[PDB]
Amino acid sequence: RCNFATISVDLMMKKYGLNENEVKCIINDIISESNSSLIAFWDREDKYLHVDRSNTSRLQYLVEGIAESVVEVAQYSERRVR
Amino acid sequence: WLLWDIFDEFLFQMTVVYQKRFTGRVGWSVNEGMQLMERVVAESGIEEAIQSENLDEITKPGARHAQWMCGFFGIVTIAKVNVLLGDYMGALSALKPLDVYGRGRQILLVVAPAYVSLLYHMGFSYLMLRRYADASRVFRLSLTTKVSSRKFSEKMQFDCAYMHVISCILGGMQPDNLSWLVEPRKLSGFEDEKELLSAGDEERFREVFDRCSPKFLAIPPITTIMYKGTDGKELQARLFRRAVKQQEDIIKLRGFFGVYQTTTTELVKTVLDVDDGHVPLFAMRLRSRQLVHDGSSADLLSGSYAVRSAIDYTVKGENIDVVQKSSYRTTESKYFMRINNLRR
Amino acid sequence: LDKHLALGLLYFYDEQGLDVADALRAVQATTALTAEGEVSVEQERKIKETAQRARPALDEFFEKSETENSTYQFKLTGSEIDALRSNRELSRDVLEAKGITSNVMKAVMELAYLYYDAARYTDASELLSLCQCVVGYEIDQRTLLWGKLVSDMCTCNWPSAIAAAEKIRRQQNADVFEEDIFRVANTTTTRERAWLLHWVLFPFFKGGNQYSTHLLNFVFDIKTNFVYQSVVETVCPHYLRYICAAAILNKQRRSALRSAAAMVLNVYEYSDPITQLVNAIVNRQSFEDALALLPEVKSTALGDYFLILHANEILENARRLIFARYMMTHGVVSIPYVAEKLGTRTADAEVWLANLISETKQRAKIDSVSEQMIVGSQARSVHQTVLDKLE
Amino acid sequence: RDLAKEVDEALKQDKYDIQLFLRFLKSYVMAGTQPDKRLLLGILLQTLPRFHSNDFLACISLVPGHVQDAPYVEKELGTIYDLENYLSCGRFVQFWEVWNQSKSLPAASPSFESQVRAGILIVVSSTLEKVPVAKMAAYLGVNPDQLQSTLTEAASIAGEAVSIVSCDTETVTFAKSIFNAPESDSNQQPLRFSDIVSIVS
């Protein structure tokens, strides 16, 4: 919702929920990304994630508008051949 | 025979044209073809005869006589000046489009072909004046549909492209892609070429030089002949090379930074050492002058040296707003125009 | 081309570096004894470097030297080969255009020519090159093909090497591909691959050219038409490790790490591990562990295996890569803890980071006025990007 | 014959016109048996007080390679050309170390030294924003004391005025100033919103 996570730091290992790990190799590989929708400004020093997703729903809306544009573009490309 | 007979024929033809032009005023019409064809042939014929001052120097004061006599109504008078200016360009000079532009018989009437010819010369003038910022904007835009902008030699399209390439390289600008399959790869290549030119190469500088020297003199080519035109080209090439080298050095200083716009003294010093083999206070002094409008000399004890360069205009959201104001206006403008085509 | 299986064992097992004691039954099928000079001897030099040395090497040296002084005197039935051996001028001449064959035959020529080794080795290579082109010859498809392989093998003295590099990508690749009905089978492909690797990456041996790291990357791989089935069969662990090293050294094709990762896993069928770990952690991406691994691996190996040569470059590329990833997103992260690791004072580290940024692989500025590296946005401008795309 | 006297007068009385000079150069380009060393050298030595200017580029175009090459025609033109490049690229120190005053043309110009200094000041005023008094003096070869007595004026653009700083940073001369060529009301935050609401509503 819609993020935030690493709540906190050490708890992230603890509740999710096996003790206490590589830690960094496990947590980094799971989080990483970057593919698809953005996460992270990740600061590993304080172990805090400053997502700033921008945004869930708006991305989908833009995708729908892009999808509609490509159909119309192709449709009108065929018409100018004809 | 072959080449030489054709040269004599052209020289004869041009002399006859000047004689007709001096005698009359109605020997040309306002057809775009005639004025463009005459200019191109005249420029070619002057260039070809160089090196051999004995022809060109006799032709030019008779071209001047025809120039100073007005044509008939229409842009025909302007067309005679455009020929004369073209002859001057092939004979070396590129600062006199200013005199031509300001002339009081060419502001009375302007019809598009004579504007194009004037603009071509003015663009060479802007390059000589080192007005990189203004030249690049005009050249980057494609030619506007009017009546004509070329007819008889369409090598003019390449000429315009060449001038834009030189202006962009000078001014700190480049193309972006928006065309076909080729333009991605081409854009990448161009960017790389510019980077290489600045900081290293050799071969890029050679390529840039060969393209550039071409525009100072103006083209259409001489048509190289062994003897005469060779000497011509050699003299021209050296003069231009020295100037372009000096401009390249200024560009290189203006292109290096410590990846910041408010660089610490140490970063500046490292950049100066990389740029040239000198102490970085001697070259700091040279950088603060060959990189225009810097507050850097005042930053003294401050250590907040700035050295700045241009950045993209108002930011991020404003760029979106500019697009959408254009879109709003376009929707209204298109609607009215669509109605007007069926209502009158 | 092709062959031999015992020789192959000697080859790869040494490269892997577990031991030498290995045989190499031989000689087989270079030839006996014909060009060049010997395959076994080249292997022996590598062995000597690994680990001293032994009875096989002594035998190989003797074999190479003679048969036989008398035979050497006897050879040549006329009427070139001379100025030491070849007729450099002739070699140049047999293309442009000379192609329609004087006499006919170089059948007796082959009989006279065959001798060999001694090794002598530059001259031997030159002679072989001259024989290759006639062009019309007669004799033969397969004999010539074997000859091409020999040229590729040795000498790797650079004018011969550059010539052989051109020859490999025109000849060998085509030969492997079918048609012709049906050749070349697994052994031939494996052997060819081994020779190519020897000729340039850097075993110990010798490698690097300018630059053919690229060549190695290009051939084993690249999908038009494909194989990679050949590489997998039957079980080339050493080759895989070498490929990982090569990828790091090169440092790009375009696609670099991703391709390497796919190749690597191939989880346990045969999988050698010291280089592999460095690449596999880096691409996945964990940043602590990777950083530690790269010095340890560098120091550990070496090992044997000197040349040295390339590996200094590899170390530099790897450090740069780990850092570039670490910066990218992620923060908005500093800089003192970067400097301490890579190991000199802060300014040198800052300039090193700035060099990564200056390649236009990232948008970033470094504040030396608070020692923070700041990244742009750019990854992400969202609505604006869409508007541009549409229009 | 007129044009030559005009070049001499342009030195001697500190006059300049680009169009007369351009015509004379255009005569030289067209007929290459006309050029005289002293007149051409005079044109070049009057481009040096006029920097920053495209006068030098106009001269480059209209004078053949051979002529501007010093040993080919046995003229001082290449030596001048080097001095011109040193002045134009801000390499004032270099210019001073190779300085001469033993040529006839500098002697036959009164106040030659001051004219060269004026050219340097023109280059500084265009391409620097704010200069220290000592740094400015080091460009001109002049003592900073005598420089102050010339620079102090009540219009900055006619002679850069003092901006005295007690202790700390050196006293600078104003000269141009922050955001006098960077920005054009771009990159402060947008005022678009008021306009955008009005035209859609």
Other beta carbons within 10 Å of D32: 14
Do residues C184 and C176 lie in contact, with contact meaning Cβ atoms separated by under 8 Å? yes
Residues in B 199-258 with any Cβ partner in C closer than 8 A: 258
Q: Are D134 and D162 in contact (CB under 8 A)?
A: no
Mutation pick from A27, A38, A61 vs chain C, by most beta carbons of C within 10 Å, is A38
Angle at B207 between CA D54 and CA C362, to 5 degrees: 95
Count of C-beta atoms within a 10 Å radius of residue D168: 9
Task: Assess contact for A17 and A32: CB atoms under 8 A.
Answer: no
Whether residue D199 and residue B328 make contact (CB cut-off 8 A), yes or no, is yes
Residue-wise DSSP of B212-274: HHHHHS-SS-----TTTHHHHHHHHHHHHHHHHHHHHHHHHHTT--SSSSS--HHHHHHHHHH
Q: How far apart are CA B91 and CA C143, in angstroms?
A: 69
Amino acid at C125: S
**Distance in Å, alpha carbon of B192 to nearest chain D alpha carbon:** 27
- The span from the CA of D165 to the CA of B300, in Å, is 12
Task: Say if B264 is an interface residue toward chain C (CB within 8 Å).
Answer: yes
Confirm if B47 and B224 have CB atoms less than 8 A apart: no
Query: A45 to chain C: nearest residue by CA?
Result: C333
Nearest to A24 among C284, C288, C329 (CB): C288
Which helix (H) or strand (E) segment is C364 a member of? strand C364-367
Kindly state the helix (H) or strand (E) to which residue B99 belongs, with its residue range.
helix B97-102
Residues of B in contact with C351 (CB under 8 A): 270
Instruction: For residue C356, give how far its alpha carbon lies from the nearest alpha carbon of chain B (Å).
Output: 11
Q: Which amino acid is at D72?
A: Y
Put simply, the answer to whether C366 touches B258 (Cβ < 8 Å) is: yes
Determine which of D25, D57, D120 to mutate to test the interface with B (most B C-beta atoms within 10 Å): D57
Chain centroid to CA C130: 26
Q: Any chain D CB within 8 A of the CB of B19?
A: no
What C43-50 contacts at long range (C-beta under 8 Å, 24+ apart), as own/partner pairs, is C43/C7, C43/C10, C43/C11, C43/C14, C45/C205, C46/C14, C46/C203, C46/C204, C46/C205, C47/C10, C47/C14, C47/C20, C49/C204, C49/C304, C49/C305, C49/C306, C50/C14, C50/C17, C50/C20, C50/C204, C50/C304, C50/C305
Dihedrals phi, psi of C187, to nearest 5 degrees: -60, -45
Identify the contact set of chain C against chain B, taking CB-CB distances under 8 A: 347, 350-351, 354, 357-358, 364-369, 381, 383-384, 387, 391
**Contacts of B149 by beta carbon, 8 Å cutoff, 6+ apart:** B112, B113, B116, B143, B156
Task: List the helix and strand counts (H, then E) for chain A.
Answer: 3, 2
Of B99, B295, B321, the CB nearest to D130: B295
Angle between helices C39-50 and C5-16 (to 10 degrees): 20
Q: Which residues of B touch D30 (CB under 8 A)?
A: 53, 56-57, 60, 91
Using the 8-state DSSP alphabet, how is residue B298 labeled? G
Q: What angle do CA C139, C98, C147 make, to 5 degrees?
A: 35
Distance from CA of A82 to the nearest CA of C (A): 23
Which tokens belong to B327?
A: 């879109």
Q: What is the widest separation between alpha-carbon atoms in chain D?
A: 77
Q: Are C209 and C200 in contact (CB under 8 A)?
A: yes
Rg (CA), chain C: 26
DSSP assignment of C275-337 equals HHHHHHHHTT--HHHHHHHHHHHHHH-S-S----TTHHHHHHHHHHHHHHHHHSSS-S--SHH
Helices (H), chain D: 2-12, 18-30, 37-47, 55-61, 65-68, 70-73, 77-88, 92-97, 104-107, 112-127, 133-140, 144-151, 192-200
Q: Which chains touch B (3 or more CB pairs under 8 A)?
A: C, D
Task: Please list the alpha-helical segments (H only) found in C154-200.
Answer: 158-167, 173-176, 185-199
| Alpha carbon B177 to chain centroid, angstroms | 22
Last residue before each break in chain A (C–N > 2.5 Å) = none
Q: Which of 20-59 (B) contact D at CB < 8 A?
A: 53, 56-57
